[PDB]
Assembly symmetry: C2
Homo-oligomer: 271 residues x 2
């Protein structure tokens, strides 16, 4: 299973992660869908970025193949603690961070609590602001295992549904039913789910204090996180750039791969 | 005067233009401020693009050093005719077009009337949609010559006013009072100016039919054309990408030069 990489103790949690490349460190933080993992989200991104940077992609606690501690208290702050724990474990003193959706919210939160540890940020269809729960997000977080339910979620993420094949739905369905996966996922964002969007968000006041050069990316047709959320982030963050991809959903790094990789590499190259 | 380049008869008008580079043709269309010219707008863009493309930058009739025909009937359609006349004169059968503000409106109009002649488009703080006249635009189009009035206009265009020096205001003031310049400019967009924003615009219905890969660029702080206008263009054009620069005004190609040039070259490279 290529989703299983290296293992390291971070913030007291045995963590599964990928580490490819040399040079300036870049931390990639995945999203929060069922069966999600660092490899699943970043397999098409790591190869491109690792040619110029040291790319670290960990499975956040509660997701992927990282340990799922008994009675673990999941929260925005605990996840930030995990990110910092991973950086500490790898002697990464300061790094750029690419946060995908759920991961974008964590990136913003990490930059606010540990400003000295974060350089540039890329926020994709990111959590971080309070937006009204969408039917797409409620469907994603409310997922129960089945190939048809996974096919529907994949359709919700994609602009071009032709990319959603029976094989892909089957493979992700299988990833979603791995031991302990659905159990931690279902108890992660229970109804009412607006509570979790709000919990993952950072206040307008706090976001306005971010000094980091930031690149906000969003798919025009995103059905999970509304474009309006990134428009708001763009008005709050001072050194921000916004890039919106037309004909693109919640899979910006997968549906607009080459454009995405070029934008991100050049953005970091500027530093 | 470096603003004076080559001369060619286009659409019956003796036209001043710049032609640098080899390969795929790219037409750069300047904005509509007092003293504006192709060189003034694109001096920092041509060098970068000409390394990979053949760059054509003409002074639109009524602006710069192109002839100002007696009793000439200026209109969106006549300007489009001029653009096509320039392309015809240079045997440019199909080209990419970069339209800056006023020029963006003309680019959209050209792509609608001569779809076969236009490939990819870059629209910067572009005209093209109906937006309420801003005080910034009313000040720009209502300009009367003076170093102080020019300094104010430059401030309206810029995010970082430190770039507006006495020398720059003086030089542009001098450009604005060249023989016949202020005369054609003042009679170009007379009050009420909303009429001209509306005249330069294309209907939502027509814009929706554009099949061209398009890159929409806008400065978050643009005081002349509101960001909301480009947000609208992004929702209308199907194959569109939107890139918004924070800490940037109506001079995207000048205030974010390196980022702008990289974005444009890679966008065209995709073709």
């Amino acid at each position: 299973n290529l989703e299983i990489g290296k293992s390291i103790l971070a913030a007291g949690v045995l963590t599964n992660y990928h580490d490819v490349g040399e040079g300036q460190p870049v931390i990639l933080i995945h999203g929060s869908g069922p069966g999600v993992s660092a490899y699943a989200n970043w397999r098409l991104t790591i190869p491109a970025l690792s040619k110029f940077y040291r790319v670290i992609a960990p499975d956040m606690v509660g997701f992927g193949f990282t340990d799922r501690p008994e009675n673990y208290n999941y929260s925005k702050d605990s996840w930030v603690d995990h990110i910092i724990g991973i950086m500490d474990a790898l002697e990464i003193e300061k790094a750029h961070i690419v946060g995908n959706a759920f991961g974008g919210g964590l990136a913003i939160a990490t930059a606010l609590r540990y400003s000295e540890r974060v350089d540039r940020m890329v926020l994709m269809g990111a959590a971080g602001t309070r937006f009204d729960v969408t039917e797409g997000l409620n469907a994603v977080w409310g997922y129960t295992p089945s190939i048809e339910n996974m096919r529907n979620l994949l359709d919700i993420f994609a602009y071009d549904r032709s990319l959603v094949t029976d094989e892909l739905a089957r493979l992700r369905y299988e990833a979603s039913i791995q031991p302990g996966f659905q159990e931690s996922f279902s108890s992660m964002f229970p109804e009412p789910r607006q509570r979790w969007i709000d919990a993952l968000a950072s206040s307008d006041e706090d976001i306005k204090t971010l000094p980091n050069e930031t690149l906000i990316i969003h798919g025009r047709e995103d059905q999970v996180v509304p474009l309006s959320s990134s428009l708001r982030l763009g008005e709050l963050i001072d050194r921000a750039q916004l890039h919106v991809f037309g004909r693109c959903g919640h899979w910006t790094q997968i549906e607009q791969t080459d454009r995405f990789n070029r934008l991100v590499v050049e953005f970091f190259n500027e530093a």
